[PDB]
Design a protein around this ligand. Sequence first.
Ligand SMILES: Cc1cc2c(cc1C)N(C[C@H](O)[C@H](O)[C@H](O)COP(=O)(O)O)c1[nH]c(=O)[nH]c(=O)c1N2
Length: 327
Amino acid sequence: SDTRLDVATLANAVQLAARAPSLHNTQPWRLIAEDGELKLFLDPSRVVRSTDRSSREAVMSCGVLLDHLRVALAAAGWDTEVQRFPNPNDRDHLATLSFRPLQFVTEGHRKRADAILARRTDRLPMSAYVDWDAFETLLRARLGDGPVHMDTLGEDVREEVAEAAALTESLRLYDAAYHSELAWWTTPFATEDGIPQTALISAEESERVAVSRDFPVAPHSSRRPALNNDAATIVVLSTDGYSREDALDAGEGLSKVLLECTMSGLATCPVTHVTELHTSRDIIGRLIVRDACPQVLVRIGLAPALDEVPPPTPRRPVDAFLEVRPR
Ligand SMILES: Cc1cc2c(cc1C)N(C[C@H](O)[C@H](O)[C@H](O)COP(=O)(O)O)c1[nH]c(=O)[nH]c(=O)c1N2
C-alpha cells in the first residue's frame, strides 16, 4: 500500500497548492481523486467570460495549480507525473497526475513549498533588484528548454508597455461585461474568492505604477512614498501558440517563475490585461522574440522589508473543489 498516495496526504497538498494565484482570484479549478490518480479540470462556471476569451487565463490558472500541486507533493515525499489533455472528448480535462514516492525530500523541495505560502501579489511600486542578472540565470535554468519562454524587457520599453496598458483600458471603456466582471470579482463582500480590498491600491498609489491593470481603488493611502515610480523588472512569459495546451503550459511556467522569485525574497505581481485583446497582445508580441505569443507579464523587484504585509487573499476550502471517488 506504501507506494500509493493516500487521501490525507493528497488533501493536505491540495490545501497548500490552492494558494496558487489565478485570474481575479477565481480559482477556476476542479479536482477529482480517483483510482490513485488526480484529474485536473477547468471549472467553466468560474471563467470570467468577457475578460478571458477562450478561457485562456482560467486554463492558465489551472496550470499554475498544476505546478503548485507538484511542488506541494514533492515536499510531502511524492513525485508527480503528468498527462496533459488526456481525453480528446473532454477539453475541460486538462491533466491527470499520477504519483510515486521520492527517495528523499531536499531542502530545495522544502523551500519551494514554503514559497507557495509566502507568495502574494504586490501591486505597490517596487525597487529594482540589484542582482537581477544572476537571478535571471536562475529563472532561465528553471524554465529549461520550454515550452514557456521569457523575455526581460528593457527599461526603454517600459513606457510602450504602459501605453499598451492604457490602450487596453480604452478598448474596454464600452465593454460593460468587462466592467461588471471586474466589479464582481472585487466585491468587498466576497469571502473565499475575488480580490479583497486589502490587496488593492489607492488612486494615489496607482499613479506610481505604470505597468498595471486598473482595478477599483482601495481607500486612500500613500504607501512606499519613497518610491516615486515602480522600478520592477518586467518579464514576459510566452508560448509557441495560443491554444488551451499553450495556456496550461503558460501557467505551469508562471508558477515556476513566481515561486523562484519568492524563494529569492523577490516581490511579484502578474499583469495580464495587455494579453487579453488582440491589439494589445500584438503590441507586446513586437517587444519579444519572433513568433512568441505573450501570455503574462510579471513585475519582479523588491518590497521594503519592514512594510506591514496585508493579510493573505482568501481561497475556497478544499471541499468546494476536490472530489474523491471511492475505489
Ligand atoms: C492568469 C492570472 C492573471 C492575473 C493575475 C493572476 C493570474 C494567475 N493577477 C493576480 C491575481 O489577482 C492574484 O493572484 C489573486 O488575486 C490572488 O492573490 P495572491 O496572488 O495570492 O496575492 C493579476 N494581478 C494584477 O495586478 N493584474 C492582472 O492583470 C492580474 N491578472
